[PDB]
Amino acid sequence: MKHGRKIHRLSRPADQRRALLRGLTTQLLKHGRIKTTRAKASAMRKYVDKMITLAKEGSLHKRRQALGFIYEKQIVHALFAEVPERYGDRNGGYTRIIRTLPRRGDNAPMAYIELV
Amino acid sequence: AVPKKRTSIYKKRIRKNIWKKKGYWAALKAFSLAKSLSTGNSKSFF
Amino acid sequence: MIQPQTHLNVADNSGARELMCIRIIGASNRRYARIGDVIVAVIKEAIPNTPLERSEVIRAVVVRTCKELKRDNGMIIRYDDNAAVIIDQEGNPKGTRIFGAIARELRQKFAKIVSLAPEVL
Amino acid sequence: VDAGIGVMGTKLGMMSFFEEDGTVVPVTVIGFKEGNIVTQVKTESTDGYNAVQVGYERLRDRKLTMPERGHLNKAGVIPMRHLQEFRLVSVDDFTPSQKLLFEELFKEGDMVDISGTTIGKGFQGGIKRHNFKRGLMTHGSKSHRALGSIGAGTTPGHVYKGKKMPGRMGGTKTKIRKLKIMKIDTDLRVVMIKGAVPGKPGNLLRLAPAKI
Amino acid sequence: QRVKLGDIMGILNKKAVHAAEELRPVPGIRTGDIVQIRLEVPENKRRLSVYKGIVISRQNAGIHTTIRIRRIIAGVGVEIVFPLYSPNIKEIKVVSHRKVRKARLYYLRDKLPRLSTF
RNA sequence: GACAACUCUCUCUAAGGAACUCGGCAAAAUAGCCCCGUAACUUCGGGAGAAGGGGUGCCCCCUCACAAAGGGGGUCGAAGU
RNA sequence: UUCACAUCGACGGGAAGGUUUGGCACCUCGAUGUCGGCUCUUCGCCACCUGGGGCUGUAGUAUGUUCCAAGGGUUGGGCUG
RNA sequence: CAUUGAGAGGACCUUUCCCUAGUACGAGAGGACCGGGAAGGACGCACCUCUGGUGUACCAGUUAUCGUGCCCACGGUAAACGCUGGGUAGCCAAGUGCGGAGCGGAUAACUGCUGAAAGCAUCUAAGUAGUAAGCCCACCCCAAGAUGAGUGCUCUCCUA
RNA sequence: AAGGUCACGGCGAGACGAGCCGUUUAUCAUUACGAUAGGUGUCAAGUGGAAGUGCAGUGAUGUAUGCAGCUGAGGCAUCCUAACAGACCCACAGACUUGAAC
Fold first, then answer.
1. Is there contact between D68 and strand H, defined as CB under 7 Å from any strand atom?
2. Please, what is the angle between helix A14-31 and helix A73-80, to 10°?
3. Which end of chain B, C or N, has fewer beta carbons within 10 A?
């Protein structure tokens, strides 16, 4: 029974679910909008918030954390060298989950992420 | 595992009706989504 | 946690060296025998000059057991070696010297066991 | 029927209470979000039996319907989410208006039986609902953990009802009896009730002296 | 003044621990240490039992912050779980510190016993 | 998408270790390279990798060919093919 | 010991059961899949054990037998399919 | 919303010790079922405080290799995670908590009480007493689809 | 209309329907009610000493900064993000008999 377990897991096995979250957050921090099924939206929400706050504190150690999580190299440098101005005193709750019509082909609930 | 005998028209009409009707209930939901999507304050449908 | 097919040590110098437990006595459970109970051990091998020879069904006690062991104060003693002490059904052992610690509570039923221990704990 | 009126609290985790004697005893911890207040009393003449209706968990008026708030209002009491009555041997001496009671009483009645909605385990199978056994896991066997047989041949001609199929396990309230009370703290209005009582911390928990 | 919050249990646990600490002072015990427990027992006419040993682990959970402790006796591996705040420990005393690079030495059980002779 | 039961492909399982069972079937367990030792029997070829036991990770050092390997010392983990 | 009936009851007789071995062969050969285990039932008693009672060649402790009693209980293994 | 409950279901099980008492009973050997007290056993309902299992959220050691330019630090990969140690919550148990009751009413076998049919007797024909884990209520969980569809304290509108 | 259902945020609830609790000026104030999920801040808890730099070492490696560091589905605090917009079902006094009281 689920009772108590609160790790949002996707349709995928462990390894591939990791990979999906890392790639998917990378591409969020790259474009700012994104379109994923709602479940992927929630699972993103957690991690991308972690990366943002990880950039709010731009010491080397943390920079190497993020350097290890995100795939694309230079989106990180742009990111932490850019955001502690954007999200100065926003203090948590960085995304926004403006949702949208389903996906012809699955009628799969589909949502559309922001950064604000 | 193998059915004995074909069902009547009676029964089958009952179940097909439950199928379609199960489709009935799931329109008025879409009609609420429509009647709300007619331009209005909302955070959905960019 | 003594099933009926375990090899115990012995904690004394009665003459046994290890011994299979058969179908414990007393508590009607018998799917599980723990400290302070009695078991029907058939000797497995012994020191070869002793009046307890190859395969002599005998009755013995459990004095150490690897499973946990609750107490009152809230401590839990757990040894590493399942061990027995050959017994008579009217009191004293028939091995005089006893090895290793035992549990003090079995005193209230096995006084002569405990008196001969080197560590009552 | 029950022996006396009872209260209803909330499960709040567990712990150990080191008895000064130096013995270790588990306890749970009962708490009251809002105090129990009588909100009715029904006689043998006006109504069919005798009982007192206590309430728990005061809440904002919105959260609660109009028939409710009218029922609560008529007796002149505060709002309250949960609401249950103890049927009591017909000796009621209670003014249905907010006789806020207390545990001046359970410390005397040092054995209490509580009624708790247990936790819910979905659609559990045979091997766990009813404590079945299972076939051999090896030796060519091909039916593990399955419910096994059902009935006999042509004569019973069907499956005797009340057969132990699988199904939903938890979710229905359960008693627990002769469960003894233990050192209580009125400043925190907490109960340190020995034993283990139905439900993960945070469900309503009727609480009433025994029916020995 | 104010009123206690809903998640009271933590506060209750803290109060009991505080009382126990006030009654007896216990130095912090860290996986590795080598303690002696002077332990009050019911009737033994001396009832200060001694329990030397290595602190295998520490299960810190409120009023059950417990130590399990391995020492070799005549030949067998005794392995006990004392609580700390138990009102029966007359006193603990931390003797040495073996400086192990780990948090819970279950390997120390089933190594060779020349390691676990207190 | 959800994450009931249950079937399969798998990982782990406290204490015992065949008690299951028609039968330890199926799992689990050994395992590589060096080094010691290797029995009953035998057609005297075999048995025999019998059995069984030990070291082996990295660093430093000089030797034996002085290409490998071995000797000495150190350091690390619970665990060194 | 005497004493038919505490207990066993020769010689013969009268029943109920339906589960053994059978007799018929009535349904079923365009098919009603066998022994033994596993899992899960549920029911019957003429009762093995627990509840109550007589009688006893019952001192007590054990019993022996019958009477009401199916609420419950009715092990783990070695050998054999 | 709170609920009575016709009906239906689960559970009321069982051993050993001690006091009674070495008493009664017995030449002694031995050695009382009248009642209490405890420990169990199987079972049943639960629960995570402790002890632990798993915990593919997680932390740490480490093998081989590829990638991040490079060293350091990391990331991927090895039928699901490479193999291992440790583990919160959850779910579990070999853990823990509790439970089988003053129960009360009819009974069966049986022992009776008064007492004729039958100017004795007989537990029975009149009438009554005791008494079984067996029956019913009690216990615990559902339950007014109980169409016999119950009950009451609140609401909701009479403008067409 | 009372009440609902849907929708929206989720759960110690759940195969799906069910259930249950939310649904923002998400108080403000003189002793309980208006934090639902996330994020954040902190604390329990776990693992166990981070990275960099320094020192000692020829080198493995150690050592200090340092119960630090990564963990933080558990506890409270925090309206930063999301419970926006809605939509729908629901009605008008509950036929017929006698009885009774004023």
1. yes
2. 50
3. N
Take residue D3 and report the two structure tokens written for it.
């022996």
Residue of A33, A35, A99 for testing the chain B interface, max B β-carbons within 10 Å: A99
Tokens representing A89 are: 């005193």
> D22 vs B23, D19, D181, E44, E66, CA distance in Å?
67, 5, 18, 16, 15
Cα gap E53→E32, rounded to integer Å: 10
Q: How many domains is chain D partitioned into structurally?
A: 1
Cβ contact C79–E79 (<8 Å): yes
CATH number, position A26: 3.90.1030.10
Chains in contact with E, where contact requires at least 3 CB pairs less than 8 Å apart: C, D
Question: Minimal CA–CA distance to A66: which of A74, D157, D11?
Answer: A74
Q: Which residues on adjacent β-strands are paired with residue E52? A: E36
Tokens encoding D36? 């129990």
Can you tell me which residue has the tokens 């989950």?
A97
Nucleotides of F under 7 A from a protein CB: 1-8, 14-23, 25-26, 76-78
Quick one: which residue's CA is nearest to F77's C1'? E101
Query: By CB neighbour count within 10 A (0-12 exposed, 13-18 middle, 19+ buried), where does A13 fall?
Result: exposed
Q: Can you tell me which residue has the tokens 């708790």?
A: D116
- Please tell me the experimental approach by which this structure was elucidated: cryo-EM
H48: residue with closest CA to C1': D14
Using the CA of C65, give the nucleotide whose C1' is nearest. Answer: F15
Q: Which residues of D touch E8 (CB under 8 A)?
A: 12, 29, 31, 188, 190
If DSSP codes are grouped into helix, strand and coil, which group holds residue D58?
A: coil
Nucleotides of H under 7 A from a protein CB: 1-5, 9-10, 15, 40-52, 56-57, 68-69, 73-78, 80-81, 85-87, 89-92, 94-102, 138-142, 150-156
The structure was resolved to a resolution in Å of 3.5
User: Is residue C5 within 8 Å of C21, Cβ to Cβ?
Assistant: yes
Measure the CA–CA gap between E81 and E84, rounded to whole angstroms: 10
Question: Residue C71 burial (CB < 10 Å; 0-12/13-18/19+)?
Answer: middle
Residues in D closer than 8 angstroms to A5, CB to CB, are none
Task: Please calculate the CA angle E31-C100-C68 and round it to the nearest 5 degrees.
Answer: 50
Work out the angle at residue A10's Cα, subtended by the Cα atoms of residues A8 and A14, and round it to the nearest 5 degrees.
Answer: 90
Number of domains in chain A: 1
Q: How far is CA E101 from CA A69, D98, E32, E104, E118, in A?
A: 28, 62, 9, 9, 18
CA atoms of D135 and D118, how far apart (whole Å): 30
Using the Cβ of E9 and the Cβ atoms of chain D, whether some distance falls under 8 Å is answered with: yes
Question: E strands along E1-118, which residues?
Answer: 33-40, 48-59, 66-71, 78-83, 89-97
Q: Whole domain around residue C47: which residue ranges? A: 1-121
Domain limits at A9? 1-116
Identify any residues that bridge with C42 across adjacent strands, giving them in sequence order: C20, C57
Question: In which domain, by residue range, is D24 found?
Answer: 1-212
The domains of chain E are located at 1-118
Token pair of E98, please?
């073996």
